[PDB]
């Protein structure tokens, strides 16, 4: 019955292609006329952090929005105080090759996973002096891409095994596994209400899951390469995807179409990181040509350029209250902007 | 400029000084990436598994070998991490000729890469005596069918070594190809020699010479 099942799959793909076409009354580019432009933006480097002796791969702010984390290839994990610019904790890592790291919202825990297919939780604020490893969770088959603390006993983890799963830190066992994708999963992003999350992989597609249920609802396909970065809109009814063909896209959830594309004829290289502003009127994007652009989020034109690092921009983060932006790179220095 | 804020600053300078001592200590090591096909006598050569990392010492110098097996993902995605490595060690088995074309294209893939422009290679051909036993009856025209040479061993191996040099199209990249005999051959000496030239070659670029 393979020929019968193959057409039953086709006829439904033809229906969904005609559903999305009959909804679009007009484009956004028509409605976004008759508004005042943002006008040229400019920021200087406020502070510089030094200590790492290898490429910076990941970093993360805290809810306090004064302390931040970072990880490098030398096998160290440093916690900085951004105001006085002094080190609080420097942890010696077990295996040298780390790719991602997180920071809990309570500010009591830290995670990091690499090419060992293992995620390690570190307990800050021990009764004795030193920091130690609370728990170790190894259930994956491939390397870890991303991980995010849902709560102090719940964490979400994606891998190069073409799957992602939800963990319980106290018992140290998998709760539920999500299976839809056909390529290596690169990034994921939590919703504001910690109910929904979306991921993006190397089959040039992105899916939207339901944490409590364990099923995919929608699939958005608009790229021509491997999706690297992804980020939710502050309102929580849209997101933006960064790809390896020098283009960013803007999708909606209530309306199923793609609403905008961002591209310049000069740039010809892939995006590493994306992030929104607090109001969500600016959209920052890290490229691998030693340059970070600042796009308008409605007009879809460049509003400014942040001064280059010596090597590729790997990770950038906007803080909660929205005062500063922080960026890392392969020349092993962090810089904070304003 | 406070009671506690001064003590907090004193702690930071103690941490700052501590990790730079480890930075100097970790610069006296030789890092080697051990690639190649599976069942190619990789284990003898060294003398959900994520990564196997080994270490030995020979003539007062510390070596570190990183073997990547049982990963089965997209290489390019995670070959960024191994961008600077003193050298690469590739292994091939002459025992069976139907894994030669797969191993040859695989070598051609790693050889000409964006990140490995100037990184030199060491090429170990194994099961030397086993290859030379079965050259008697089974002709060499089964693989690399266009030409072989003489029927017997001595001038056959020359033809394979020639194919791997033909695959190199890089302007300034060396290939130190040696031959291993069965499972009883000293290889530590062979590597120690190959590592020396690579350090000498790097220092010449640093000097006014060349």
């Amino acid at each position: 019955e393979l020929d019968q099942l193959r057409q039953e799959a086709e006829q439904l793909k033809n229906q969904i292609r005609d559903a999305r076409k009959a909804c679009a009354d007009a484009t956004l580019s028509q409605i976004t006329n008759n508004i005042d432009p943002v006008g040229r933006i400019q920021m200087r480097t406020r502070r510089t952090l030094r200590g790492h002796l290898a490429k910076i791969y990941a970093m993360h702010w805290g809810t306090d929005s004064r302390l931040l984390v970072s990880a490098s290839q030398d096998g160290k994990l440093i916690i900085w105080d951004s105001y006085t610019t002094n080190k609080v904790h420097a942890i010696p890592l077990r295996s040298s090759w780390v790719m991602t790291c997180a920071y809990a919202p309570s500010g009591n825990y830290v995670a990091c996973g690499g090419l060992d297919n293992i995620c390690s939780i570190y307990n800050l604020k021990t009764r004795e002096g030193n920091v130690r490893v609370s728990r170790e969770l190894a259930g994956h088959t491939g390397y870890l891409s991303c991980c995010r603390f849902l709560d102090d006993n719940q964490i979400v983890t994606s891998s190069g095994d073409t799957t992602c799963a939800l963990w319980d830190i106290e018992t140290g066992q998998q709760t539920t596994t999500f299976t839809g994708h056909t390529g290596d999963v690169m990034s994921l992003s939590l919703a504001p209400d910690t109910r929904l999350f979306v991921s993006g992989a190397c089959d040039a597609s992105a899916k939207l899951w339901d944490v409590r249920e364990g099923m995919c609802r929608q699939t958005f396909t608009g790229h021509e390469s491997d999706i690297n970065a992804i980020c939710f809109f502050p309102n929580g009814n849209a997101f933006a995807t960064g790809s390896d063909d020098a283009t960013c896209r803007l999708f909606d959830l209530r309306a199923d179409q793609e609403l905008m594309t961002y591209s310049h004829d000069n740039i010809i290289c892939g995006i590493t990181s994306v992030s929104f502003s607090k109001s969500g009127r600016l959209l920052l994007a890290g490229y691998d040509d030693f340059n970070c652009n600042v796009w308008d989020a409605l007009k879809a034109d460049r509003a400014g350029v942040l001064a280059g690092h010596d090597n590729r921009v790997s990770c950038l983060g906007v803080t909660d209250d929205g005062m500063a932006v922080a960026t890392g790179s392969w020349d092993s220095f962090l810089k904070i902007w304003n | 400029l406070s009671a506690e804020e001064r003590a907090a600053l004193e702690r930071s300078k103690a941490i700052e000084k501590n990790l730079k001592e480890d930075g100097i200590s970790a610069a006296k090591d030789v890092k080697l990436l051990l690639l190649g096909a599976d069942n190619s006598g990789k284990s003898t050569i060294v003398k959900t598994t994520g990564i196997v990392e080994t270490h030995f010492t020979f003539k007062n110098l510390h070596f570190r070998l990183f073997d990547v097996g049982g990963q089965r993902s997209e290489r390019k995605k995670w070959i960024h991490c191994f961008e600077d490595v003193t050298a690469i060690i590739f292994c091939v088995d002459l025992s069976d000729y139907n894994r030669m074309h797969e191993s040859l294209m695989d070598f051609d893939s790693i050889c000409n890469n964006k990140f490995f422009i100037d990184t030199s290679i060491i090429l170990f051909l194994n099961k030397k005596d086993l290859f030379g036993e079965k050259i008697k009856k089974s002709p060499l025209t089964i693989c690399f069918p266009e030409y072989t040479g003489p029927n017997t061993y001595e001038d056959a191996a020359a033809y394979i070594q020639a194919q791997f040099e033909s695959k190199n199209r890089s302007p300034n990249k060396e290939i130190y190809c040696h031959m291993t005999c069965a499972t009883d051959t000293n290889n530590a000496q062979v590597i120690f020699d190959a590592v020396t030239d690579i350090i000498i070659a790097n220092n010449l670029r640093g000097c006014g010479l060349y």
Partner: single-chain antibody
Amino acid sequence: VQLVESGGGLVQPGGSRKLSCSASGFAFSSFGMHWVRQAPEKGLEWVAYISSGSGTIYYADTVKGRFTISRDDPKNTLFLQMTSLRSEDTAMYYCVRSIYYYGSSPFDFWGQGTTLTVSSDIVMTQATSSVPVTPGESVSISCRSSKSLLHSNGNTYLYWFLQRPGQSPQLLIYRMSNLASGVPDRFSGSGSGTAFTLTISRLEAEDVGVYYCMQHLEYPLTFGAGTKLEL
């Protein structure tokens, strides 16, 4: 965690003796260390301090040049060497640990203390001696300062300690507002400038002791006179 100290009995006036404090159950290398005295019918008072890595040393005004302090990291032991003892050093001696980085609690854990006998700045006032109390009632303790303990940064340096009858004193509140780990949710702290208040809600049995008031703005650390809660 366990800090135990020993050495010292009765001496001859103008002699010498050593005090040894031996630690176990934590990383001794990382923490700083203090010495604190308590006369037989009086409040607490500070003596000496050594930082982690032996980088900085400070003494009191009273005992400067007479006493000396030193630590041994390999064996985890703290030494206090005292020479030419006068006839007003007759007191218990406590052995206190502390740590300093952004968002931590100094003076969290105290020792047990040894009895030594000899045979023959910021001023802070607590206008109370004994306060009448009854169980199931709310009370207020008031510590008044000399000059304002608020810095350029928002944080105010004021600590509250409690001593039960025949035991070692423990930390209740650090940096005025914040509350110490393991302490119940009955105690609360408030104050602005030079006047401060400790408020207790629904006091119950095994909660009566001498309450002390300490500042950490400048060296040397001055303590209060102390407030007593009756039976």
